[PDB]
Amino acid sequence: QINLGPSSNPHAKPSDFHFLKVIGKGGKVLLARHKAEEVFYAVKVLQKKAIVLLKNVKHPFLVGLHFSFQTADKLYFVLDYINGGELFYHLQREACFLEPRARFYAAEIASALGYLHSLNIVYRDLKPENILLDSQGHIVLTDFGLCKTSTFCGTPEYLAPEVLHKQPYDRTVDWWCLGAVLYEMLYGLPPFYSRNTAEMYDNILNKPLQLKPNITNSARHLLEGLLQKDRTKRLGAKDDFMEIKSHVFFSLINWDDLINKKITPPFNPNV
Numbered sequence: 001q002i003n004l005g006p007s008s009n010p011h012a013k014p015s016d017f018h019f020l021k022v023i024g025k026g027g028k029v030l031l032a033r034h035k036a037e038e039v040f041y042a043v044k045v046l047q048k049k050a051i052v053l054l055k056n057v058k059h060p061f062l063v064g065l066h067f068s069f070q071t072a073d074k075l076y077f078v079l080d081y082i083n084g085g086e087l088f089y090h091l092q093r094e095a096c097f098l099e100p101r102a103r104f105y106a107a108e109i110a111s112a113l114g115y116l117h118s119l120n121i122v123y124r125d126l127k128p129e130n131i132l133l134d135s136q137g138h139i140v141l142t143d144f145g146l147c148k149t150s151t152f153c154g155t156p157e158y159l160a161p162e163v164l165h166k167q168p169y170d171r172t173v174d175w176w177c178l179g180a181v182l183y184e185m186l187y188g189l190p191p192f193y194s195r196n197t198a199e200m201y202d203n204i205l206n207k208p209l210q211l212k213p214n215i216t217n218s219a220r221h222l223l224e225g226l227l228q229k230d231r232t233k234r235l236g237a238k239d240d241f242m243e244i245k246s247h248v249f250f251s252l253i254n255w256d257d258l259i260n261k262k263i264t265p266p267f268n269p270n271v
């Protein structure tokens with residue numbers, strides 16, 4: 001019987017919902033419709049045996065928690081249901097995005113990362129699997145840790161080199177992940193990618209970054225800096241979000257209009 005902070009609805013019980021599909025799994029996430037205002041929600045059920053109030057984590061590009069409740073064995077978090085689907089589902093259809101499109105997504109991710117870092121939070125696991133698109137076309141991040149081999153293929157790796165060789169990591173890992181997510185939007189594959197897992201990990205940890213010729217010098221400088229193996233030399237080490245915010249690549253971004261959703265998304269998902 002954990003107090004669950006102030007987001008607690010002492011009246012809510014799982015009986016108040018209709019659980020359609022299990023949309024995420026590990027502790028899983030479900031799609032459910034409320035039996036009042038017939039509104040669609042995403043409910044994250046965890047399960048007690050998995051042993052920090054917070055939940056004032058409100059950002060335009062992060063999932064919102066409406067309320068939370070508990071049974072006496074399962075833990076439920078009623079979150080916003082995001083309609084537009086994964087961002088990299090759209091990347092698969094097109095192979096790669098143009099720089100204006102990628103700039104918009106990396107700008108929305110950078111401001112959400114900067115906000116998390118101001119709350120002393122580290123995403124650590126920023127994967128395309130966790131980057132969704134709302135019905136209007138804006139970035140909304142999920143799985144930012146608020147609550148919890150193979151020879152070939154192997155699930156793509158976005159973790160910074162220091163995380164891979166179990167070393168002290170900080171907010172700078174998120175700036176590596178931003179560079180990896182951005183590299184993929186531009187080139188079509190995750191950085192250092194190989195079908196051979198041993199080869200891919202060897203690239204990530206010991207091989208210099210291979211930036212191919214068809215991106216602007218601005219994007220190239222940003223990826224070079226964001227994808228720095230040494231966390232002390234990486235973009236974001238000195239003054240976090242402020243270095244990203246001012247970079248040549250984000251010249252066209254008015255950061256105020258960006259957070260106030262006054263910039264039209266470069267694509268609207270048909271929903």
Ligand SMILES: O=C(N[C@@H]1CCNC1)c1cc(-c2ccc(NS(=O)(=O)c3cccc(Cl)c3Cl)cc2)nc2n[nH]cc12
Pocket residue numbers: 023024025029042044055063064065077079080081082083086129130132142143144145146147148
């Ligand atoms: O479709 C989703 N996930 C699929 C599984 C991987 N590919 C996509 C999805 C997940 C969550 C979701 C996932 C993880 C979390 N994680 S959490 O720790 O960061 C968190 C954030 C904010 C408040 C709270 Cl209480 C929590 Cl626990 C929260 C929401 N929300 C959603 N809304 N609509 C869709 C949602």
